[PDB]
Amino acid sequence: NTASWFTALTQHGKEDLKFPRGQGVPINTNSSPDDQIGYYRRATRRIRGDGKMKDLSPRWYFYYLGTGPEAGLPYGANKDGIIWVATEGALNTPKDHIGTRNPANNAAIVLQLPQGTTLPKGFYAE
Amino acid sequence: NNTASWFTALTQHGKEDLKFPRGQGVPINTNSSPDDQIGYYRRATRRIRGGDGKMKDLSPRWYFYYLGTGPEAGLPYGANKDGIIWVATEGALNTPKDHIGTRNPANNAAIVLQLPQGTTLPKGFYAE
Amino acid sequence: PNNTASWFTALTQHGKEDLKFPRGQGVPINTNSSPDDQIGYYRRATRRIGDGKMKDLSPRWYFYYLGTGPEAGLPYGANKDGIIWVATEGALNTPKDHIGTRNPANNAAIVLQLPQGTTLPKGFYAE
Amino acid sequence: NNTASWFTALTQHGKEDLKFPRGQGVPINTNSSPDDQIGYYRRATRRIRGGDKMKDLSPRWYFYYLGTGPEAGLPYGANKDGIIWVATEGALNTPKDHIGTRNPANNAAIVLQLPQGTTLPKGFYAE
Numbered sequence: 388n389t390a391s392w393f394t395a396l397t398q399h400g401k402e403d404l405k406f407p408r409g410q411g412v413p414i415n416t417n418s419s420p421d422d423q424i425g426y427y428r429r430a431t432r433r434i435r436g437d438g439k440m441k442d443l444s445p446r447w448y449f450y451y452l453g454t455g456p457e458a459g460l461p462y463g464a465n466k467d468g469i470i471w472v473a474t475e476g477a478l479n480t481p482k483d484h485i486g487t488r489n490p491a492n493n494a495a496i497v498l499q500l501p502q503g504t505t506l507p508k509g510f511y512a513e
Numbered sequence: 514n515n516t517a518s519w520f521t522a523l524t525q526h527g528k529e530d531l532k533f534p535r536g537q538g539v540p541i542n543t544n545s546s547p548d549d550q551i552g553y554y555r556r557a558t559r560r561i562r563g564g565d566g567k568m569k570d571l572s573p574r575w576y577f578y579y580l581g582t583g584p585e586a587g588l589p590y591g592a593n594k595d596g597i598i599w600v601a602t603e604g605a606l607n608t609p610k611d612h613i614g615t616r617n618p619a620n621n622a623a624i625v626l627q628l629p630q631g632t633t634l635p636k637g638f639y640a641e
Numbered sequence: 642p643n644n645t646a647s648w649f650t651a652l653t654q655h656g657k658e659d660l661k662f663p664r665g666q667g668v669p670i671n672t673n674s675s676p677d678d679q680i681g682y683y684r685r686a687t688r689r690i691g692d693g694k695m696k697d698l699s700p701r702w703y704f705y706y707l708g709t710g711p712e713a714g715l716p717y718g719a720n721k722d723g724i725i726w727v728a729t730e731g732a733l734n735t736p737k738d739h740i741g742t743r744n745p746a747n748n749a750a751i752v753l754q755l756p757q758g759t760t761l762p763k764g765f766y767a768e
Numbered sequence: 769n770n771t772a773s774w775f776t777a778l779t780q781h782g783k784e785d786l787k788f789p790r791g792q793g794v795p796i797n798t799n800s801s802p803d804d805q806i807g808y809y810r811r812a813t814r815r816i817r818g819g820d821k822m823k824d825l826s827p828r829w830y831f832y833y834l835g836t837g838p839e840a841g842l843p844y845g846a847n848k849d850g851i852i853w854v855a856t857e858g859a860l861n862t863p864k865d866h867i868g869t870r871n872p873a874n875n876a877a878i879v880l881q882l883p884q885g886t887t888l889p890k891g892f893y894a895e
């Protein structure tokens with residue numbers, strides 16, 4: 388059971404996540420400028436109040452390029468629930484030296500975005 | 514000899530596989546203690562001759578089996594195997610649950626599957 | 642700076658009943674804590690939010706250890722609206738200032754895992 | 769279906785072949801328990817156009833757990849060309865089918881890391 392190294396971004400709007408070119412990568416003090424590349428993956432949740440199945444807000448999780456449930460996807464690949472972000476100067480290489488997070492060892496880092504980053508409408512962390 | 518799941522199946526309707534966050538996913542079984550609440554779901558696909566004549570896939574069914582029981586009885590919790598997802602309730606025991614075993618439909622109906630109250634399901638899955 | 646939060650994820654309720662737990666269970670699992678620190682309270686949290694509607698949202702309940710959180714000064718079993726108390730046998734009725742509260746900018750919340758063999762009332766769910 | 773090693777490859781740059789002492793050569797895998805630390809290295813040679821001919825690139829050697837990989841039905845110590853066996857003190861002679869092998873579509877490879885104090889034969893590095 389792997390997980391993301393960060394906490395999710397919650398979606399209240401009706402449009403998918405979409406960062407502008409150059410921003411969207413979570414801050415990580417252990418990574419290098421070469422690693423600032425990856426993708427957000429949407430995860431939907433449904434529960435049972437008495438109207439059978441209820442649809443909750445989807446949450447988006449970030450995974451470094453070459454890691455996570457779509458580790459084999461190349462940067463830019465079009466897939467529902469996947470959006471791509473990168474910081475200029477990042478290498479288009481897989482980041483298998485970072486990998487994914489094991490919850491039984493490390494806890495999720497609080498996702499923080501760089502100064503000046505713009506989140507789309509209806510997107511908030513925690 | 515040839516036994517079935519103790520519970521009815523969860524039918525896959527969406528494009529996602531059946532996954533469960535930690536703690537949730539184990540079907541309600543009043544005849545079992547909280548030590549037994551641990552097992553796996555095994556996907557079972559069915560193919561049928563479609564309206565054209567070529568075989569078509571039916572909606573996948575997911576059958577729950579307690580740990581150490583069912584077709585993958587000889588597998589430990591968290592094993593990596595396609596079509597096998599693992600569920601456990603906080604406080605379960607990582608031991609084979611032979612005392613429960615598997616069902617013989619000749620003398621035992623299937624328990625209708627029911628999930629704990631407030632269980633998160635992926636899209637395409639429904640909790641009764 | 643100056644951000645205070647619960648150490649655990651919230652217990653949302655979509656039913657019409659308030660939160661209650663039978664005696665001995667109701668504290669969430671925390672690996673970095675001792676059985677002596679298994680005593681605290683749940684606090685209520687109201688909220689509102691298609692367009693053109695002031696939608697009344699479902700209330701949540703955040704767990705705080707005894708002597709911490711927005712009601713740190715309250716003693717165990719104190720009577721106040723929106724506040725219910727939980728504890729397990731073998732816990733000390735002492736303030737858990739060494740556990741404190743969570744800074745949501747440095748540490749992420751711990752997923753609310755109830756005790757081994759504890760069922761929440763109808764209308765409640767964890768997320 | 770088609771799967772690859774869970775780790776990256778040890779590339780043979782010299783003429784010597786892999787050989788480990790009693791209790792060394794198992795890569796560091798946190799998910800695996802001391803029960804599972806047993807397996808084998810399989811040599812994977814690659815051919816390329818030399819520029820005129822076929823040139824055998826420096827053979828990469830991938831590690832697969834016992835029972836997993838392209839050599840499933842082989843027990844520990846099985847003698848076969850291109851296979852070297854490795855164990856750790858306190859493990860079991862069991863087909864580790866619960867570990868399996870990696871689908872690169874949804875899993876990155878773990879960087880092959882060896883415990884502190886491990887010895888290696890000539891020409892061996894991890895890239």
Ligand SMILES: CCCN(C)Cc1c[nH]c2ccc(OCc3ccccc3)cc12
Nearest residue numbers: 388489490491590591592593774799867
């Ligand atoms: C809270 C869950 C935290 N655990 C991580 C879940 C877990 C419990 N038992 C496991 C056995 C295997 C596994 O991943 C399969 C695997 C990974 C890497 C290499 C080979 C095989 C994950 C797990």
